[model samples]
Target: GMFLLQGAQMLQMLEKSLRKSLPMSLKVYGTVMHMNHGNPFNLKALVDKWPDFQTVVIRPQEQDMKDDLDHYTNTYHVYSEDLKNCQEFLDLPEVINWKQHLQIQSTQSSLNEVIQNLAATKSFKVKRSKNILYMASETIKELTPGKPKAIDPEMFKLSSVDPSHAAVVNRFWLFGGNERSLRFIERCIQSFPNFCLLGPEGTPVSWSLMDQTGEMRMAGTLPEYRAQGLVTHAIYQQAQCLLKRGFPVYSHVDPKNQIMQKMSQSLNHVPMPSDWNQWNCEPL
Candidate 1:
């Protein structure tokens, strides 16, 4: 009952902020709110499990929350209309004193101020900026699905990601190269519906994974497998599944990644004007 109540509340919040929030917000928050409803992977679910960690206090007198998870260690995300909540959260001693990653998404104006404030602070480092693209169900449905030339659908198998491929996947990620990154990938493989195209020998050459935000992520094709359209196929397959479930299909792409930008355009993904910033923090 509590889970459902929270889901309902979150749905209301999303509806209220749909116009002002990021495009990916609806899909990410909605999927987790509907699926299992109370798993730690979902921010709403995490808030329920650890109510004290709800740092986005709306009112100045909102004194019911507590600092459950040290803001520095575990990743925390906030999407709010008011920049004060963001400033408060960042100004907290836990955030200022610890080294961690703080991700915030809001309207372009709000984000502009937040980014400026964080940038002025010596502790925060702006690591990555990405544009969020949303593919409407109609857009994906209208796509003429076709296999890559020279590839036989029957010859290759589609399967979920396995632990054995964690190393390779981790190595390909910018945040990878450590045990923590490998473990993170492993957890994602275990929890998400990650699809991969396996070669005849059962080696995964191209793959994509749905992230906690319910967005397609970490998609890549081996260098030798480039130009095979394997990544497109994998993404298309996943997009179909998401659409059938009434979930929004979205992906985040760095502005400089021309290939991915082209791929997203080919699929008719509409890019929003606002960009999301990923701020990685460290103690001075």
Candidate 2:
């Protein structure tokens, strides 16, 4: 079933409710429906039904709201025409009731928010030459005589290597690795070289890696190793591996972190807007 289009007022209502009743620590994240309102609402309702209802979100839809109502919960309406009317309706105080609290999200909306917020405090900087993103098959082709010498597992072990020596990583990522993420890193070794220890030996510190989407995750460097460049190297190495494998690497950098922002750009990563939806009863 197609769900009705909801307005920003609906989004505001949800946010206000979450801010008022949920714990400050509660977090909400979700995708909005762009073409299928019903599917988004259906999925959202399931998330809301969870013991932790404070966290709920929507997917994405192409159209905006056509009308506004004072009270709305999971109730949805689709907007195919009359967008101005929807905006007017949504703007009506009588039509917008914060008490209704309903959350929504869309891939575009969420990313837009995230990328915009990130831009406020950080800007992307260029610091590297272009690198290739090779798939397994395409990689085999790039390996032809004299093309930036192909790197592979036979050359070195990604997990065992030191983050600093990885060339492009920053100092924040020198921590040890876990079994699963480590195994994955081992696989990445085939595409990048110098996957070995670099710099001096210090205590094992923090760790971070990228998910399949090339989104960086689980990052934390030992406090003592913060300024050394381990984080930089780790990120560089990971990017090289993915780029070689024909994947685009993207990351959500917190607006407040100058160090991380610098590191991201140094390795040719760009900041995009993405939202971190929190489903807390209280506004944090």
Candidate 3:
């Protein structure tokens, strides 16, 4: 009906925007868009479980309003901020009030501007910073094919990550190992798709969790299991699952972490634009 005109037009505009933008740039939003298309009902059910799920898209009115859509913006927060946006998207409410010690992915300029603006407001403080490289499907081909030889089919147990393993998983994360961090990981495990390979002792030796933007997160293997390609196998398994279900297969790696960077590269994951950085923001 005519009553649904605006809603329909907005969706059309979203599709048009998505089609025109680079997949690496729209990593998070594009993945979410795909999920909405593939399983809108299920996506809604998952989103409702998170208390802070929000997205904002800018729509221009007329030629006089904004000649270039470049000035317009699209942003979202699943659990973390997606690094892609136009000029003024960070000015939105969903971004300014970001709490929970989460890292934001954005261009160097955008990261600087956000820090300056938020610091001036005195409501948020920067806790830590890391440079990020976004790797898409094209780059994913760098990974070596086949599972690691060290993985014994009978001895290794591959299964979905349950909330019960939250503590063990949190131990390996840089920001985790604390009560609050454990809670965050638990919620994420409950809400997202995660796969883990457990040793004969039933301890997770390698695992990967899908983050808010549908990318791999907290992927790791115990020191003793390093080079066995356990993490690589887990990543491949998770990526395939995401791809089959209509989600983008990507990974956000910290550039400083040579091990992870090399691992990603081996998997054929290439870096996105060099302009992006990860900023950990927390409330004062």
Candidate 4:
């Protein structure tokens, strides 16, 4: 169910058609389009080994990387509501070669059944079942991200997170906090444009990043800066840049963290009814 038969024209058509389910496929489209041009993540796209794409999977060009903790590196984004199509393709050795710690990411909950079926297999077990709420730009193309005047432009300005802040950004990542994560943070910031609300001293206080999948990934505001709606300032600026490049302006918010959900509201993000899950699969 894995092959290189997919071409740019095929992928081009796929991008356009994907928009019908844009909330669930923005990262897939973004990564596919990213593959055509910037390819920041060194990724490749594979269809379900068929005449066309009823199901698709976007993956790293090389899956054997050593950073097991960074889903940003080893994760695969799956797009298919059809349980059989996606499930069949996932059985390909290329997708899961009896390996451990490889992650399967979804933009919407439709793929939940496919992964759940996977858990029934002898070689596979889902490690985490956390649900993520997707917020996207289809709901935000024309609106202002936040009340700009709330924080004076002079007192707090927009800037990029400096490479030196890698350790600090990694402090509460919730994903990884080891030396490997430090490597990813530095690598990610250096590779792409990050947006941050700079403090009076010109240091980043709130920040957002465009991760390998080209969606708004890690974002945070300092503890002291929390209540003033600083998160919107950081992500709003980031969205402006990403939108200009025609990349998807979207984010994955953990539904349980109501605090983050409130902050997402400041930017006027539309909450998708679906839930996204990070399926961490490992060999038994």
Candidate 5:
């Protein structure tokens, strides 16, 4: 019997257990904490049941007009203590709307396997599956950022990636390519803290933004700006901002992206034993 859990106090109680679980529950914990705090993403939380449950879900509030393109916005995160409860949670209509496109974000091995098996049973084709590596840092101040080179410190100004750059970011992102992605990026920039390094032209040469799931997402540097410590500066600033907001300081990097992996290592971010994962299920 999957159900919605309401009230900050109740969610906070759920939070205590999730926190103790650590890293695995970090996404749900961060989302729950943000919901308890300011709820910048206008999200809600659900559990399989209260007091004794196996799964937790975090998703957007049901809306009148579901945007078609923002799979990122339509995305939901699910975590369970085991396989049976996770399979039950995945079967819930609220978690995976059959009428509209949906995505499930996860980090647990059990849910990962369950989603695959259920995807087969339900005939929900895996449109896109992104295997992500989760990284976090308890100590941000000690991160060793290599000094910027080939550009004077005065050549670039530190600033937030505002709404104006949403289109550019949307186009550059691996998952973003259209109006929906643009809108989602715009929402993220408006709702969360972002950091960027502005070139002499006053345009961003490097940037990063926080997502509703509380991860540092959309990080990139213009080709000309690569390997110059510009990305290091942007990510460091955003990590500090997330931490300051009393949120977890973490980012999801594709396991195949060697460059980003090295960058995370250089920042002294520790990789979790489990991989952060994403799955897109489309109505066929």
Candidate 6:
């Protein structure tokens, strides 16, 4: 109920803001309020009620909606479980880089094993630093017991600005979270129980976070620092951090990007059986 209210409120604010700053050739998409449920009335009914938004994308149950598949212009298989059969799904060669959307899972025990194996093969050392920071409480107004941080601002900056900083922050979110995303972020700041490493200029060059299940996201390298192996190091450090917090680390990557796919495999981040895509047709 709280989740629904927050989303509705967000939508109201977004709609008003968009109207004030109408873009040239695009309309914002509506949120999927009840995708986790098996009720046809949830999204479909909402769409029916709001005929102005003529189109709707419903993520129906893989089994229940199979017969009426033609109703939807796109179909994405969502797998929140194991990745054991990911390769088999990839073999089909669908139109999309379907694997990119796969939300894989990991446990602390598994991540520790990955770190140990990586240490054996590489000359890099994974150390625990306390210079990382989580989302400020000011930004994260609505936090759940499980998700207790604000990641949107950092994620936006990463996707748009620098992948290096994004990667560092991503590591923290992925491997170190539990009702305290902000504390983890704070850890990346001063020298306390948590200490983050600063660059030569005393600026944060990397950050990481542990999302649900300690899975890591946004592990990236600065555009200028590409191909220098920082991405790998940052990812390993984030995974180790997550393990320290009694969590696991996993990641999602594009299937078309064979380089990353291979790298993930090497890091013990196996492909998961899942897929997602947005229907881009303008509503009638």
lDDT of model 6 at residue 243? 46
Candidate 1 lDDT by residue in tens digits, 60-95 = 111211332222224444444456555656565533
Ranking by lDDT: 5, 4, 1, 3, 2, 6
Write down the TM-score for model 3: 0.67
* Candidate 1 to truth, TM: 0.71
- Name the top lDDT candidate: 5
| Backbone clashes under 3 angstroms, per model | 0, 68, 9, 0, 0, 34
C-alpha RMSD values across all candidates: 6.9, 16.3, 10.0, 3.2, 3.4, 19.3
Q: What stretches of model 4 exceed 4 Å from their correct place?
A: 5-7, 63-72, 129-132, 136-149
Candidates' C-alpha lDDT: 0.54, 0.33, 0.53, 0.71, 0.74, 0.31
How does each model score on TM-score? 0.71, 0.34, 0.67, 0.86, 0.89, 0.31
Ranking by TM-score: 5, 4, 1, 3, 2, 6
User: Is candidate 1 or 5 superior in lDDT?
Assistant: 5
Overall local distance difference test of candidate 2: 0.33
Off by over 4 Å in 2: 2-107, 110-206, 212-214, 273-284
Q: Over the stretch 26-142, how does candidate 4's per-residue lDDT look in tens digits? A: 557666766666666666677865545678888776544665545546778778857788888887767554364677777756677777787676467776555555554444453
The per-residue C-alpha lDDT of model 1 at residue 32 equals 43
Residue lDDT tens for model 2, 103-203: 22121222233323322323321111111121122222332211122333342223533443222233333322433334334433322222222223432
Q: What is the lDDT of candidate 5?
A: 0.74
Off by more than 4 A, model 1: 1-36, 42-73, 93-98, 101-109, 118-123, 132-134, 137-150
For candidate 1, list the clashing residue pairs, or say none.
none
Clashes of 4: 0
What lDDT tens digits, residue by residue, belong to model 6 across residues 73-168?
123212211232322322233311222222111211122333333334433233321111121121122221112123233322221113233334
- Stronger candidate by lDDT (4 vs 6): 4
